[PDB]
């Protein structure tokens, strides 16, 4: 038995053309401190994480759970936008399994961490000649914190075995330490704006993703070009049947 085989071929589900407001959580002027890192569960729009080559010095680009080539094709659920400003030396210890002064007392990652971190130089932008003593971190605490936890309390650390309350002095030290950032500091000491993502493909149904592809319109041809979409072949013609606004298929 004979049969005709289709030429240009696809299937029709993708129809999107949605706006996606970004580059303000990524290119802001005011950013959070080390311990003041805030969470934005991004579920707004497509959020294309692949078009980020406008800024050249994106030295931290490695990602573990997913590859950047196959990043904006699958669907994530409840991605977290966490941003903080640290030094360039602390960028290498953001990865799980590392140790340091920031990986035990300020902010630590789980061993099963999903996502990756993006960092870039911000010394000219974030360093004044008189110093910027507004980004500060904590070094002293009673015990090591859990991952994904914030500490706000500025109580005086009781390093020694002497009773002191409020007033500092001997063996009573201030935990919060302000950074000494200068534009003349070398690589690793400059203020570096740091953004980290946590996709966390669990629990809720997936909300944030978008392919956003498009195709053409060629009426009455034995092809399948269909906005890069859901399975199904045939030919495409013009039909005069009427749908209600919430109708999709037939």
């Amino acid at each position, epitope marked *: 038995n004979f049969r005709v085989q289709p030429t240009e071929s696809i299937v029709r589900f993708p129809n999107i053309t949605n706006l996606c407001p970004f580059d303000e959580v990524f290119n802001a002027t005011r950013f959070a401190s080390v311990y003041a890192w805030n969470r934005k569960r991004i579920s707004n729009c497509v959020a294309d994480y692949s078009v980020l080559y406008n800024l050249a010095p994106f030295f931290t680009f490695k990602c573990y759970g997913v590859s950047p080539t196959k990043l904006n094709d699958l669907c994530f659920t409840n991605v977290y936008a966490d941003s903080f400003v640290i030094r360039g030396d602390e960028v290498r210890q953001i990865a799980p399994g590392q140790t340091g002064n920031i990986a035990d007392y300020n902010y630590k990652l789980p061993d099963d961490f999903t996502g990756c971190v993006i960092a870039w130089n911000s010394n000219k932008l974030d360093s004044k000649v008189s110093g910027n003593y507004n980004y500060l971190y904590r070094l002293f605490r009673k015990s090591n914190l859990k991952p994904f936890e914030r500490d706000i309390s500025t109580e005086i650390y009781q390093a020694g075995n002497k009773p002191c309350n409020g007033v500092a002095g001997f063996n009573c030290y201030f935990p919060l330490r302000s950074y000494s950032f200068r534009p003349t500091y*070398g690589v690793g000491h400059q203020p570096y704006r740091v953004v980290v993502l946590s996709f966390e493909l669990l629990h809720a149904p997936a909300t944030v993703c978008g392919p956003k592809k498009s195709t053409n319109l060629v009426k009455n041809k034995c092809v399948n070009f269909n906005f890069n979409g859901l399975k199904g072949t045939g030919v495409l013609t013009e039909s005069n049947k009427k749908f209600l606004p919430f109708q999709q298929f037939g």
Partner: antibody
Amino acid sequence: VQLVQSGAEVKKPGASVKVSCKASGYTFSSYYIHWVRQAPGQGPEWMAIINPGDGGASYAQKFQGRVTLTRDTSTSTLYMELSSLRSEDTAVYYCARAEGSSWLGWFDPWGQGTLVTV
Amino acid sequence: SVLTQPPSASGTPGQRVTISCSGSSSNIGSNYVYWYQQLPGTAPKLLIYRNNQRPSGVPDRFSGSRSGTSASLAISGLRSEDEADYYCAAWDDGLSGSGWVFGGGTKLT
């Protein structure tokens, strides 16, 4: 709209020198000042940045601690002080205006400079 | 880095002469480049802006542009007043110190 300098003479080795250059024209309190020195047989190197008012300066690695920097608005004299003067530091110091509250940018025309020798 | 420059640029009046400043990584590729002219007996002046325009006024015969990790300046119509020397300036952003490392030193005849 021009920058004038001071004078200097031969100084003893291992001492401290002080240079103040008066500035007239543009706003004194909203313009950074770059301090450089020019030596014969070599080019000029940046060595101090002046933020007027609080005098917050970010010196280089080779110019940290050895340079004392003072900025004001009433007397409008930019005080620079250098310690441990040797025969290598005999040069003409220049103070120049900058963009103002921003390091990166072009350079304003320089003054006549003050020659210091040891 | 070091920003090496040729010690001299031999030439004749009426002939175009090109001077080249050799930079390094993260100095010419991203940081803007400045060409400065040092005059004998007077204060140094802003010879040129970023490599598109003139500071206050000059004929367009003074050409300057960057390429790769280096910079170049072509000067034609040499006169007696044009007999001077030039320097190259670029932001450093180097390790342990981010001042202003200038170029080397040339000589125009």
